């Protein structure tokens, strides 16, 4: 159950945030809102170097405190381990956010299984071992996951159908639980985040030059974000067109699962 | 682009298939519909014993030929290399059905990591590497790749979450490389099914005490699979009930992907 | 602009309504219920004899005033002097509740072109000429028009061709209108109500078979009614079935308007 | 239920037509494409000047035959007799096309009753009179009528509100005569054909310094009408956009209508 509320900044005062992917692009922006915010966060991916800007920054912005851990996320060990420390160091976990991926650009598939694997691993997997890892400190705070996808996690397209693939798992799996949470009682919320073209660099280079669409600002992408997951909304939607999130709504899907639950 | 025709029985008559998870539930089925239609068949599963059975009796109903290989999908050398085997036995290959699931049952996600990375192995990465595998071979048919997928791969269930993860990606996966051929004027259909309960020994079990539906039979289950496959249709939905295929139909997303391209 | 306030019985209390085919049905429920909350009533149909008794039990009820004229909406003289009657009687308008309709019974088209006219005429037009007459007052008042409509007015349905000609008439003409007072700054609500089965004598002396038990309540659909009014909402659906309620929404329908609206 | 095949032209060769509002316009040009496929036409509007200069050019696009007749809508009587007159003409009927409105120009709703009545006289109730006499005629060929409606006659816009009330009437009674045409088993088709802005004489003239959009060709109009109905579709919709006829279509009635009928 959403909060029928409005988002204030302030609702994340205080509050324990892991945010992973944190080194650019909209988990950077996210790890920055939080800061602002006054929210402890712990941010990771692999670059050491950049996190602890990221870390410096955010301490100058305001946070409750903030550190990084840096690993790959093909670890799960590492994904494990990260989760621990993380709690340890924050005394808590109140929202886990899990933004990161692999390596993606535009290009057909052809019999790349080690990329498939990988997004898998990646993108989907490390999703899942971050918050089994998470889940009793989750538990304990009725706190929140956010789990970050993509038009490509909702519909087709060519040239991305690893990741694809990966992000439509994101989907199936976190759907379930949350069901299951429901009928279990269990107060965590899942947001799925259903995002467009977000300005980051890393989409900025993919899309040159094969698409030529308008980009949403990803410091506005990334509040968005925090905000579905402050007021434990079932999905957040975020493109530069209004008309494109009204058709990314599913009430079929809706329906279906509404009459299978009662 | 699918055929603009009703569907004969005699569009597989000499046609070389491979069916995975064929061994029971709707994949015998569909080996036997298949067989019923004097196809080529290369029946798959974990027991040879099973297997063998359902190879006699494919024989009885008039295949063409048919060949067992027994093995498990959890293991991706033997993914690419039954197809290289199966190809082999009937020289070419026309359609490959991608039916077998590992062993799911109704229960909460309790921290169970190995079940989705099992789930997402034998359900998801091995349908790949079969695709790659057959690909070749499918290419020179201008053949099709049919992937069995559920309700639970379209929409949210409890209780079935590494198993609807699975089924998810698939089709985020094979929808995409739809999209891939269709530019890249590749010409091998791409097939997902959609299926509600059906009267598979397993599912009965599975749903026994749990869910009170009414189970559609496995034998027209089967058949509309093949036909959809045959017919080249993008998605094959079947369920007791019509208004269920209603409702997993999806237009916005339709409409999302032909703006897109 | 719909009213963002839950529904209070005394949001109708003092207030000055016309209800139109209020001698039975869901017109007389209203009444009665417009009546208990205290409001001042004045209630139309043909019959003097039943619009006494509506207008007896709505003195008994509570109603700040109650009043009956007579005569038939075929007349369009009668609906426009019916209206300023009323009005000045009450000393305004608050709200006009457009509810009578000519007698319908289910039947297959037959060349009855007499019958296409009186509908269109009674069941359509004079609630143009009853809302022309009542402008003036319900600006002054920023009140509200209520015009009580059908499924069969959303969607056809075989037997009451005629009917569902002058039930989408309505939707169309006053939908139309309700766009010209968005933009002309006119401070008049019109509600369109699309109603399901309800179990008044004339459905279900219509009606056939087992559909008489999906009936929905006359009295629960007349508060329905008058609370949608009461709201300024700009339909109000009302059916035994949410199912049903689902399915008479029209979506597209609203981006085609949406999109126009600035156009 | 529609003809399941594509259209040809050679479908309205030698068939009897009737064409209201056909002095100008799409009527005109509806005129003007039977003529040149062949089939028998008759004509109508109130202004013979402009009817003869129609008639004239039908015959000379190879008409199998073309007449006029004269006169007002608003006249019950001269629409009754009009398809007599007609059916006389041409030895029966084929396609009855109602077409014509009474002069309607945008502006704000102001008491003009004589104008809701008039609207509803001529737009509504003459389609009705129209109907009646030519359904024995076109009981006897299994013929169609064609039914020309308009975005306004299935949604709401202001400064049309008399119009729009005749428009959506047609809807509501042409739809349930269809309705009672399938159980009674009368194999007379009905087309209901919803247009958007056409480049006809009197919209141009109507939308000029109030709308600026997008005008569809009338000639491709007329034809798409004359398609539908010869195909017995139940609704035709035409627009320069292709997803204003995605939105005009109501998924949700022919449902409520489909489980109605079962
Ligand atoms: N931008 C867009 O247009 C869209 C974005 N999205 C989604 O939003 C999310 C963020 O995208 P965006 O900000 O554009 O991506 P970026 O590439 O900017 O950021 C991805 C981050 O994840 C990290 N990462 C990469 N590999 C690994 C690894 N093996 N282990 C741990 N971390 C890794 C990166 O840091 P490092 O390299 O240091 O490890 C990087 O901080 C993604 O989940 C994506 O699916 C969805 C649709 C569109
Ligand atoms: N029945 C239903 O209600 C529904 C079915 N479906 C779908 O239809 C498909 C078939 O379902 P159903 O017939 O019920 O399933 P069954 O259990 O009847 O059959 C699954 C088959 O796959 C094989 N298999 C199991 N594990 C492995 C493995 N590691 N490697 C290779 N093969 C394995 C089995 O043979 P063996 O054990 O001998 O190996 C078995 O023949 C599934 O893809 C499923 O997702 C979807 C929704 C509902
Ligand atoms: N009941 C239902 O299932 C449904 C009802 N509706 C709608 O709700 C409204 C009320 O329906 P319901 O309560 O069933 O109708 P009723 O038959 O119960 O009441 C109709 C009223 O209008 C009056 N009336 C009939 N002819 C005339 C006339 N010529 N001039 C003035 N008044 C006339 C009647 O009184 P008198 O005869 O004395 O004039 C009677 O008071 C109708 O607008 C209808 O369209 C819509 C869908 C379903
Ligand atoms: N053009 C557009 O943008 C749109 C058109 N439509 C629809 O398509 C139809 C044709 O429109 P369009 O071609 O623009 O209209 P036109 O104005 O060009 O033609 C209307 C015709 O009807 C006739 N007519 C007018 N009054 C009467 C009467 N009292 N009795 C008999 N005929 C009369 C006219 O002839 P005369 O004056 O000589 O009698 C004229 O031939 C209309 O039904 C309309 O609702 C719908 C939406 C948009
Ligand atoms: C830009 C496209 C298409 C988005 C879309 O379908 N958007 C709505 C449709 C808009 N319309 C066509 C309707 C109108 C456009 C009006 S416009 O004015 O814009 O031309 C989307 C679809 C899949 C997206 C990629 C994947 O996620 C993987 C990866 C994640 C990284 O993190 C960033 C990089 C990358 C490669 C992503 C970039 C971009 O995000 C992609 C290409
Ligand atoms: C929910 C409420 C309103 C719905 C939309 C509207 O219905 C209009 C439109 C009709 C098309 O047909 C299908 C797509 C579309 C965009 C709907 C999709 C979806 O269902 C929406 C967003
Ligand atoms: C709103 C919320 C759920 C929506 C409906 C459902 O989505 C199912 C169905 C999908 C088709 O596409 C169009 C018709 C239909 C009935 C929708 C129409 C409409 O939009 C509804 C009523
Ligand atoms: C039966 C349920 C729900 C299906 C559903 O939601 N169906 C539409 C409902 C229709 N309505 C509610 C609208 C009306 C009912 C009319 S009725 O008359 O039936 O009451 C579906 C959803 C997910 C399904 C399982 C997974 O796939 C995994 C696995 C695959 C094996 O291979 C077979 C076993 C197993 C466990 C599956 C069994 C069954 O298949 C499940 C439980
Ligand atoms: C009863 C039918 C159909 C209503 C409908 O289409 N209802 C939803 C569909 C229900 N399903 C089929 C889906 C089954 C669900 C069962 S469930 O148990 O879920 O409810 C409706 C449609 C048109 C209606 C008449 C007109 O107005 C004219 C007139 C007005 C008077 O004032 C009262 C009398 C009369 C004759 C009206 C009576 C009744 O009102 C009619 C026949
Ligand atoms: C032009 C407008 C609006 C139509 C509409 O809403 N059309 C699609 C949607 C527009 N969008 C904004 C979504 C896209 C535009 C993109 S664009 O690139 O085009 O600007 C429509 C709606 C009602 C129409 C009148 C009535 O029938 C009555 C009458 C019939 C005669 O016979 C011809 C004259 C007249 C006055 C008609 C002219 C015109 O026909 C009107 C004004």
């Not at 299984?113 to 691993?121: F, N």
């Not at 965590?188 to 995002?195: A, E, Q, R």
């Not at 660099?201 to 968005?224: N, Y």
Request: contains cysteine; charged residues 20%.
């Amino acid at each position: 159950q959403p909060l029928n509320e409005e988002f204030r900044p302030e609702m994340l005062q205080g509050k324990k945030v892991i945010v992973t992917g944190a080194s650019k692009g909209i988990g950077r922006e996210m790890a920055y809102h939080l800061a602002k915010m006054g929210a402890h966060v712990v941010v990771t991916a692999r670059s050491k170097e950049t996190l602890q800007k990221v870390v410096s920054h955010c301490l100058e912005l305001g946070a409750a405190s903030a550190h990084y851990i840096a690993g790959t996320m093909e670890d799960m060990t590492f994904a494990e381990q990260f989760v621990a420390q993380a709690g340890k160091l924050m005394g808590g976990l109140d929202m886990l956010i899990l933004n990161h991926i692999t390596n993606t650009s535009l290009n057909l598939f052809h019999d790349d299984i080690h990329h498939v694997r990988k997004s898998m691993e990646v993108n989907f997997l490390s999703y899942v071992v971050l918050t089994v890892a998470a889940l009793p400190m989750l538990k304990q705070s009725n706190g929140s996951i956010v789990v970050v996808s993509s038009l490509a996690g909702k519909v087709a397209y060519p040239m991305v159908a690893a990741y694809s693939a990966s992000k439509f798992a994101l989907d199936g799996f976190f759907s379930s639980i949350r069901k299951e949470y429901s009928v279990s009682r269990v107060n965590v919320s899942i947001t799925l985040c259903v995002l467009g073209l977000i300005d980051t660099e890393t989409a900025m280079k993919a899309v040159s030059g094969i698409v030529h669409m308008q980009a949403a600002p990803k410091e506005e992408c990334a509040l968005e974000i925090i905000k579905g997951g402050a007021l434990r909304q079932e999905e957040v939607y975020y493109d530069s067109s209004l008309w494109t999130t009204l058709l990314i709504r599913n009430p079929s899907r809706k329906i279906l699962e509404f009459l299978y639950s009662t």
